[PDB]
Amino acid sequence: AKVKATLGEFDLRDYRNVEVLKRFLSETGKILPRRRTGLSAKEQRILAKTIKRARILGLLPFTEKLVR
Amino acid sequence: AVKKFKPYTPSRRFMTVADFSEITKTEPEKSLVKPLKKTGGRNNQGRITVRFRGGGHKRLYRIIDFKRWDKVGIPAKVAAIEYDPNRSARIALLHYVDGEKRYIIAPDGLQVGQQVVAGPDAPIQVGNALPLRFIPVGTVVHAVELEPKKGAKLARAAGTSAQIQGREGDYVILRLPSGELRKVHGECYATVGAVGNADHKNIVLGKAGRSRWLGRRPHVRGAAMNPVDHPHGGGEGRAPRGRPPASPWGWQTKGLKTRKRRKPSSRFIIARRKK
Amino acid sequence: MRRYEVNIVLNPNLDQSQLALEKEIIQRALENYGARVEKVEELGLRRLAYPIAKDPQGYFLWYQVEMPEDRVNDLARELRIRDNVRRVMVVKSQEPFLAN
Amino acid sequence: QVASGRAYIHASYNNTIVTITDPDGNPITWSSGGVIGYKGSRKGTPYAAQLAALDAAKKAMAYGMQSVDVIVRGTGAGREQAIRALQASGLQVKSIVDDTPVPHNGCRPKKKFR
Amino acid sequence: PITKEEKQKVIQEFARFPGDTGSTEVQVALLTLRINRLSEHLKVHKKDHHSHRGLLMMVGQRRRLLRYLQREDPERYRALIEKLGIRG
RNA sequence: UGGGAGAGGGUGGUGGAAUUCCCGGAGUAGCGGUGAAAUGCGCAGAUACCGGGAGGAACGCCGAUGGCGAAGGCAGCCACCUGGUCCACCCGUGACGCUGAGGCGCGAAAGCGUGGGGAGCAAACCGGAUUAGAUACCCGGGUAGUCCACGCCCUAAACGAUGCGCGCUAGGUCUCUGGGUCUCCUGGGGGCCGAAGCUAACGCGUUAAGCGCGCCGCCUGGGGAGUACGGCCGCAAGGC
Ligand SMILES: [Mg+2]
Ligand SMILES: [Mg+2]
Ligand SMILES: [Mg+2]
Ligand SMILES: [Mg+2]
Ligand SMILES: [Mg+2]
Ligand SMILES: [Mg+2]
Ligand SMILES: [Mg+2]
Ligand SMILES: [Mg+2]
Ligand SMILES: [Mg+2]
Ligand SMILES: [Mg+2]
Ligand SMILES: [Mg+2]
Ligand SMILES: [Mg+2]
Ligand SMILES: [Mg+2]
Ligand SMILES: [Mg+2]
Ligand SMILES: [Mg+2]
Ligand SMILES: [Mg+2]
Ligand SMILES: [Mg+2]
Ligand SMILES: [Mg+2]
Ligand SMILES: [Mg+2]
Ligand SMILES: [Mg+2]
Ligand SMILES: [Mg+2]
Ligand SMILES: [Mg+2]
Ligand SMILES: [Mg+2]
Ligand SMILES: [Mg+2]
Ligand SMILES: [Mg+2]
Ligand SMILES: [Mg+2]
Ligand SMILES: [Mg+2]
Ligand SMILES: [Mg+2]
Ligand SMILES: [Mg+2]
Ligand SMILES: [Mg+2]
Ligand SMILES: [Mg+2]
Ligand SMILES: [Mg+2]
Ligand SMILES: [Mg+2]
Ligand SMILES: [Mg+2]
Ligand SMILES: [Mg+2]
Ligand SMILES: [Mg+2]
Ligand SMILES: [Mg+2]
Ligand SMILES: [Mg+2]
Ligand SMILES: [Mg+2]
Ligand SMILES: [Mg+2]
Ligand SMILES: [Mg+2]
Ligand SMILES: [Mg+2]
Ligand SMILES: [Mg+2]
Ligand SMILES: [Mg+2]
Ligand SMILES: [Mg+2]
Ligand SMILES: [Mg+2]
Ligand SMILES: [Mg+2]
Ligand SMILES: [Mg+2]
Ligand SMILES: [Mg+2]
Ligand SMILES: [Mg+2]
Ligand SMILES: [Mg+2]
Ligand SMILES: [Mg+2]
Ligand SMILES: [Mg+2]
Ligand SMILES: [Mg+2]
Ligand SMILES: [Mg+2]
Ligand SMILES: [Mg+2]
Ligand SMILES: [Mg+2]
Ligand SMILES: [Mg+2]
Ligand SMILES: [Mg+2]
Ligand SMILES: [Mg+2]
Ligand SMILES: [Mg+2]
Ligand SMILES: [Mg+2]
Ligand SMILES: [Mg+2]
Ligand SMILES: [Mg+2]
Ligand SMILES: [Mg+2]
Ligand SMILES: [Mg+2]
Ligand SMILES: [Mg+2]
Ligand SMILES: [Mg+2]
Ligand SMILES: [Mg+2]
Ligand SMILES: [Mg+2]
Ligand SMILES: [Mg+2]
Ligand SMILES: [Mg+2]
Ligand SMILES: [Mg+2]
Ligand SMILES: [Mg+2]
Ligand SMILES: [Mg+2]
Ligand SMILES: [Mg+2]
Ligand SMILES: [Mg+2]
Ligand SMILES: [Mg+2]
Ligand SMILES: [Mg+2]
Ligand SMILES: [Mg+2]
């Protein structure tokens, strides 16, 4: 179920693309590991950097309560 | 910077003086000075009502503009920054475009050549005066009025400032230089910035004489006196206090609060001072 | 001159004239700081992931610009000053890094 | 008297406290290992959390409580058992959300935690 | 930073013949440009020790080149430092 | 000349999580803490829960057997200033190189001066336990300090216990970052396993502890002792 797969061409430096980005967060808000995103080193780093910008902007959350 | 001295006499060893680096004009504006009536600490009865004062350098009083809401919208150029013997802060010479000249206390950062202004629409920049209700919460501010139109009373000493912490109805809430938290009225003027000459506190007088120049006459311990004079007086040899340490007039002086209890402004002071 | 992408968030409970007004302060400043506007994209209201100024929503602006390197910082300050401006974030502009 | 509400479970290694609140969040009642009768470390146990959540839900029902939302903070040994008990109580449990507080590396912990 | 343009002017200003890059002269002159900027930068960021090391390295480098150039052709050296205001 | 990666450094801004305290609300008999407890806190209304506020400090996930730096070391995000370094092109200089006694700079923590700052933590210190005792370990408190600016100190298991540069001597697998004709090849880093060889052994092995040249530093039985004396440095502690 690797996330990089379930998407087309997309931008890792694109911090406003909330719809793409939010898929890389666990349901608890955490940036997901490489085992679940399927990114390389290089890409995964830009992923993290832009998710981080995004939360600053209001677009992505910093944390989410876990439901059952 | 404070200025040091080589120990070429015993006192120069620890004496430090201000650097006066900000000073650009070494003579007061003749129409803005007036004589200071030196008091000695004596009141109108002739009686000393404040001890140990007298004998300092002569001074001309520089008339300061602690209102400022007096000339809303009329900008002025900062002509010079000058020495003012009546306060720790330096003072700034204002040339209003009007042609009127006034002094203000010089905020840290004020540059000669620059422009300042007062009123509800003044830019939130250093040197400008506005009612408190128009100043962004969080900004640090000085020369604050305590009641509308009554003149700057808060944060005037070298290096001081208050910071606006938030608002509440007709009032804003300031943190005073003491750390006291107080509601001041929103309509009160305040000038953005802190007061300048912040190194003032690091000056070391260095010798008995320099206090003497400041008009501060020697201060004498109750212990060095006799019982007619002071609660601590007398006793054979040196003596410990032998009672709770007191003022010449007998009131206790380590800890006893003294602010009047039922005072109307209590309603407006949110938190007494720190530390 | 270098390219940056100014992001701005405004009070979501303004009327359209207040908002136009803020934009006027904003556009003056961009110009005053020698910013030359290029693209511009006003997606307006949009729900936030968390509250900013104790309020679930934000009014989003965005301006690809070209300005003097020195003035970018001072501008962000002048941008942030207004009690209605709730975030500014001025990012050095960059070439998209593509996946898939 | 209120129909729907909240149940918070504070589960630490030492105890379980359960307080039931109204919809706006204000407590109607609370209970804990101590309230149900234990002192010391026994308070920390799963049986402790059970009696606690029951007594908390029992007290809530007599104020009309019927459906609750369950909020869980802690990783104590009384945690999961505390939830069991709320379900089996006679209360609805529309949800179970974990809002355990964790810092994004904040204050330095006490020494026991390093 | 230094602008590519400013680099050229210097490269051009110093070059021994048209296409010249990396002769001793150009080498020394380009260094002097990075030197003086760092020197300046450090005047404000006195607490930037890491960059200061680099400064030292460059100063070192420029020095070797200058010693080489002085060995091979005094006139060219004397003129170079006179043109860049260097030995103190 | 064109490109790259990165917690490399400095300045300025700035975001959310948590803790603490204050304010409001609601609520009652305990909370907390341990191996178990007690001190402590709590009917003068604590704990737990909601909303508001203040403040300092550190930046969860990403995060790695990862990266960057000469080392110490460096981690939210943003911009500015700035160093190192690698690649590709094979364009320029024409041995301009290596090392380096002295010198100069940098140098974790603790410590020190002046002034800030102080939420959490916590030497000293108070008290509770444990115990034969318990100046400890564990529990409740707690001041320096931890944080900032500027100036000092100059140590270390400052470690790879491995000085720097160059050349030469099988490969296998993992990884980071470039350039390719992109299966695969070629650089520069970081790990493992190993040819030859080394080595007292343990182990090292193209990141040599192998085979060689250059330069530097250092060792010469254990203790006494990194002490004494002298000298130089330091505000002191103390350092050499
Ligand atoms: Mg002196
Ligand atoms: Mg002198
Ligand atoms: Mg001197
Ligand atoms: Mg003398
Ligand atoms: Mg003397
Ligand atoms: Mg001055
Ligand atoms: Mg000065
Ligand atoms: Mg005169
Ligand atoms: Mg006259
Ligand atoms: Mg006259
Ligand atoms: Mg007078
Ligand atoms: Mg009279
Ligand atoms: Mg008379
Ligand atoms: Mg008389
Ligand atoms: Mg008196
Ligand atoms: Mg007197
Ligand atoms: Mg003065
Ligand atoms: Mg002075
Ligand atoms: Mg003093
Ligand atoms: Mg005087
Ligand atoms: Mg005195
Ligand atoms: Mg005296
Ligand atoms: Mg006496
Ligand atoms: Mg006597
Ligand atoms: Mg008498
Ligand atoms: Mg008497
Ligand atoms: Mg008496
Ligand atoms: Mg006496
Ligand atoms: Mg006596
Ligand atoms: Mg006596
Ligand atoms: Mg006697
Ligand atoms: Mg005696
Ligand atoms: Mg006597
Ligand atoms: Mg006595
Ligand atoms: Mg006494
Ligand atoms: Mg007595
Ligand atoms: Mg009053
Ligand atoms: Mg704002
Ligand atoms: Mg317990
Ligand atoms: Mg170099
Ligand atoms: Mg030379
Ligand atoms: Mg309360
Ligand atoms: Mg709260
Ligand atoms: Mg590593
Ligand atoms: Mg060639
Ligand atoms: Mg060397
Ligand atoms: Mg040396
Ligand atoms: Mg150090
Ligand atoms: Mg330290
Ligand atoms: Mg210290
Ligand atoms: Mg001490
Ligand atoms: Mg200190
Ligand atoms: Mg201090
Ligand atoms: Mg004890
Ligand atoms: Mg005992
Ligand atoms: Mg003890
Ligand atoms: Mg303790
Ligand atoms: Mg503590
Ligand atoms: Mg405390
Ligand atoms: Mg001290
Ligand atoms: Mg190590
Ligand atoms: Mg090494
Ligand atoms: Mg050693
Ligand atoms: Mg050894
Ligand atoms: Mg060496
Ligand atoms: Mg050797
Ligand atoms: Mg490769
Ligand atoms: Mg490639
Ligand atoms: Mg490295
Ligand atoms: Mg390799
Ligand atoms: Mg091996
Ligand atoms: Mg073999
Ligand atoms: Mg190999
Ligand atoms: Mg050997
Ligand atoms: Mg010996
Ligand atoms: Mg011997
Ligand atoms: Mg010694
Ligand atoms: Mg020693
Ligand atoms: Mg000695
Ligand atoms: Mg040594």
Q: Pick left, alpha or beta for residue E79 (phi over 0 → left; psi -120 to 50 → alpha; otherwise beta).
A: alpha
d(CA C51, CA E1): 40
The string of DSSP codes covering B7-20 is: -SSTTTTT--EE--
The string of DSSP codes covering E9-75 is: HHHHHH-SSTT--SSHHHHHHHHHHHHHHHHHHHHH-TT-HHHHHHHHHHHHHHHHHHHHHHHH-HH
d(CA B64, CA B244): 43
Residue B230 CA to ligand 28 centre (angstroms): 9
d(CA B198, CA B19): 11
Chain B CB contacts of C28 below 8 Å: none
Q: Which residues pair with B104 in a beta bridge?
A: B92
Residue B229 CA to ligand 73 centre (angstroms): 94
Number of CB atoms found within 10 A of residue E87's CB: 9
Calculate the CA dihedral of residues E51, E52, E55, E60 and round it to 10 degrees.
-130
Closest CA to B96 of B120, B77, B110: B77
Question: What is the C-alpha radius of gyration for chain B, rounded to an integer number of angstroms?
Answer: 22
CA B150 and chain centroid, separation: 17
> How is residue D71 written in tokens?
């909020």
E strand spans, A1-68: 10-11, 66-67
d(CA B144, CA C7): 36
Q: Is B117 exposed, middle or buried (0-12, 13-18, 19+ CB in 10 A)?
A: buried
- Residue E67 lies in domain: 1-88
Q: Are B193 and B158 in contact (CB under 8 A)?
A: no
Question: Per the structure, how many domains does chain E have?
Answer: 1
Q: Which residue do the tokens 């030196």 mark?
A: B38
CATH of the domain at E69: 1.10.287.10
Give the one of A10, A55, A59 whose C-beta lies nearest to C99's C-beta.
A10
User: Side-chain half-sphere of B11: how many Cα atoms within 13 Å?
Assistant: 9
Determination approach: X-ray
Q: Are D30 and D22 in contact (CB under 8 A)?
A: no
> How is residue E71 written in tokens?
């060995």
**Nearest-nucleotide field for E52 (CA, C1'):** F83
For the sheet with A66-67, list strands across it: A66-67, D95-98, D67-74, D4-12, D15-21, D27-32
Closest CA to D18 of D49, D62, D63: D49
What is the resolution of the experimental data for this entry, in Å? Answer: 2.9
Sorted by sequence, the CB contacts under 8 Å of residue C27 that are 6+ apart come out as C37
Question: What distances in angstroms separate CA E13 from CA A22, D65, E23, E25, E29, one per listed residue?
Answer: 55, 88, 12, 10, 9
Write out the residues surrounding ion ligand 5, Cβ under 5 A.
B 10, 13
